[PDB]
Design an enzyme around this catalytic site. Structure first.
Site, PDB file in Angstrom:
ATOM      1  N   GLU A  11      -6.797  -4.441  10.617  1.00  0.00           N
ATOM      2  CA  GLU A  11      -5.921  -3.137  11.061  1.00  0.00           C
ATOM      3  C   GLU A  11      -5.997  -2.999  12.619  1.00  0.00           C
ATOM      4  O   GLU A  11      -7.067  -2.655  12.996  1.00  0.00           O
ATOM      5  CB  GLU A  11      -6.091  -2.242  10.312  1.00  0.00           C
ATOM      6  CG  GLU A  11      -6.048  -1.924   8.776  1.00  0.00           C
ATOM      7  CD  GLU A  11      -6.273  -0.604   8.082  1.00  0.00           C
ATOM      8  OE1 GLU A  11      -7.658  -0.582   7.655  1.00  0.00           O
ATOM      9  OE2 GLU A  11      -5.633  -0.021   8.151  1.00  0.00           O
TER      10      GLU A  11
ATOM     11  N   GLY B 167       2.528  -0.910   4.822  1.00  0.00           N
ATOM     12  CA  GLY B 167       2.216   0.609   4.727  1.00  0.00           C
ATOM     13  C   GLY B 167       3.591   1.126   4.306  1.00  0.00           C
ATOM     14  O   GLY B 167       4.010   0.950   2.973  1.00  0.00           O
TER      15      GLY B 167
ATOM     16  N   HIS C 109     -10.282   0.956   3.856  1.00  0.00           N
ATOM     17  CA  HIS C 109      -8.781   1.373   4.658  1.00  0.00           C
ATOM     18  C   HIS C 109      -9.308   2.414   5.656  1.00  0.00           C
ATOM     19  O   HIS C 109     -10.055   3.280   5.674  1.00  0.00           O
ATOM     20  CB  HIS C 109      -7.697   1.870   3.829  1.00  0.00           C
ATOM     21  CG  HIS C 109      -6.411   1.762   4.588  1.00  0.00           C
ATOM     22  ND1 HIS C 109      -5.944   2.802   5.220  1.00  0.00           N
ATOM     23  CD2 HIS C 109      -5.588   0.781   4.323  1.00  0.00           C
ATOM     24  CE1 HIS C 109      -4.867   2.331   5.570  1.00  0.00           C
ATOM     25  NE2 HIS C 109      -4.471   1.231   4.974  1.00  0.00           N
TER      26      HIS C 109
ATOM     27  N   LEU D 238      -0.996  -6.374   4.489  1.00  0.00           N
ATOM     28  CA  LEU D 238      -0.923  -5.098   3.715  1.00  0.00           C
ATOM     29  C   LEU D 238      -0.048  -4.126   4.295  1.00  0.00           C
ATOM     30  O   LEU D 238      -0.148  -3.969   5.476  1.00  0.00           O
ATOM     31  CB  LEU D 238      -2.366  -4.424   3.751  1.00  0.00           C
ATOM     32  CG  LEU D 238      -2.671  -3.382   2.853  1.00  0.00           C
ATOM     33  CD1 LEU D 238      -2.497  -3.323   1.472  1.00  0.00           C
ATOM     34  CD2 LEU D 238      -4.158  -2.833   3.324  1.00  0.00           C
TER      35      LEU D 238
ATOM     36  N   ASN E 136       1.010  -1.176   0.059  1.00  0.00           N
ATOM     37  CA  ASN E 136       0.114   0.110   0.153  1.00  0.00           C
ATOM     38  C   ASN E 136       0.916   1.256   0.119  1.00  0.00           C
ATOM     39  O   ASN E 136       1.325   1.661   1.199  1.00  0.00           O
ATOM     40  CB  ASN E 136      -1.018   0.164   1.333  1.00  0.00           C
ATOM     41  CG  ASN E 136      -1.930   1.076   1.178  1.00  0.00           C
ATOM     42  OD1 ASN E 136      -1.865   1.953   0.343  1.00  0.00           O
ATOM     43  ND2 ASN E 136      -2.798   1.320   2.189  1.00  0.00           N
TER      44      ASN E 136
END
EC number: 5.3.1.1
Lengths: 244, 247
Positions: free
Chosen positions: A164, A228, A94, A226, A9
């Site tokens: 998350e 960052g 998100h 995922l 991402n």
């Protein structure tokens, strides 16, 4: 059984120069895309550049998609437009869109339905706040976030979940991640069925870097990440290597 | 003066093939970009494809831009990124963003601040509802909307205003050129009150209601209508005749 899934991402970052540099370093990593999914999510306007610079072993997608189809929806990218461009994946829900642009559970549902109507694969994000975890509401909150959209899944290889840990932005241990991952899979099992639950990939979407990727991936219900800020560095290839 | 400004808002529409077709037809129109601005606004993911296919006489832009800079803002495109890509124009405050995505006057202001800070030119939209027009609040509303952001304008060629008569979109009411002209006159007054006369006479104010090949000349010949942000009609090859009204 489940194919690992490593996603970059890039969020709102990149220049054409930097993307040229980063994509080149990524291409130097030898991996088999039949055994591992590796997906890069550039900024919308960078997608064509990024796609052209990335070898085909890298799958690609965009960081948001519309809840509407084509029409009078200024600033939106529809699932139909993404499908026409052969954009394979979309990120949905998100935390940063839920936070800054007030995206709701219903928006997530409708984005997922539209994406699945137009045969896109979806990366669907959820997870509890610090206040929610402090009140021992993790399972409550994730049950609700997941039940908002979960009945829309027919093919459980084509929707990928992302936990998350917003509570941590504290810092989540691999075992603490694993415990929620297991809870999520149980939610999927009891809402959709056991075969479906054992198929679906559930990625960790807390802060992933080169030093913790191995500890995270080895957990039994953690199927990838995922990633960052670590995905903007050429050492992302080492994170990829942890899943190979 | 004022240089006319004809803008194609493709909204959420297009395929690789339809844009190929459409851009080719546009390219056959011979106009002088120093005599009028012609700006195409494709979907973000269509920007490169669209910019490649359009001849350099066409200006291009994107239909939205972030109020945040670079960083942890998933789904956003910064003014920084647009600058790096030489994306010339950005649309801000479109009624469809105010409606569906809860975009506020503050959001519009910060998006404009960020755009001008990064040398982007902004097409900024505002306008009153049916209920507001019926209650005679047109000037109050428009004055509030323009005052959210007008003090940021540092160059009155580089920011372009769009009146969207939302009272006449999907309502059963149609705005006449005469009504449009009057709102544009009202808007130029508002700018003169807040910025000054030279500023107000310099700024392009575009009509953002429904524009087609039949009504276009009746709109742009009005004294205070300097062009348009065209919706559905800008998806047709006949858009070239809308451009011709401004040549």
């Amino acid at each position: 059984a489940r194919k690992y899934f490593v996603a970059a991402n890039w969020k709102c970052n990149g220049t054409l120069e930097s993307i040229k540099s980063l994509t080149n370093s990524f291409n130097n990593l030898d991996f088999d895309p039949s055994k591992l999914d590796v997906v890069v999510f550039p900024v919308s306007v960078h997608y064509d550049h990024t796609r052209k610079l990335l070898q085909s072993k890298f799958s690609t997608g965009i960081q948001n998609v519309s809840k509407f189809g084509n029409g009078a929806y200024t600033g939106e990218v529809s699932a139909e437009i993404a499908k026409d461009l052969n954009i394979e994946y979309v990120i949905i829900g998100h935390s940063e869109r839920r936070k800054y642009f007030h995206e709701t559970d219903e928006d997530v549902r409708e984005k997922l339905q539209a994406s699945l109507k137009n045969n896109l694969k979806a990366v669907v994000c959820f997870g509890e706040s610090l206040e929610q975890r402090e009140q021992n509401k993790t399972i409550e909150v994730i049950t609700k976030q997941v039940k908002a959209f979960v009945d829309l899944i027919d093919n459980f290889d084509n929707v990928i979940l992302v936990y998350e840990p917003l509570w941590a932005i504290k810092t989540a241990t691999p075992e603490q991640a694993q415990l929620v991952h297991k809870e999520i899979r149980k939610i999927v099992k009891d809402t959709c069925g056991e075969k479906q639950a054992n198929q679906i990939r559930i990625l960790y979407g807390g802060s992933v870097n080169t030093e913790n990727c191995s500890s995270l991936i080895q957990q039994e219900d953690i199927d990838g990440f995922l990633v960052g800020n670590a995905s903007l560095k050429e050492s992302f290839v080492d994170i990829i290597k942890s899943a190979m």
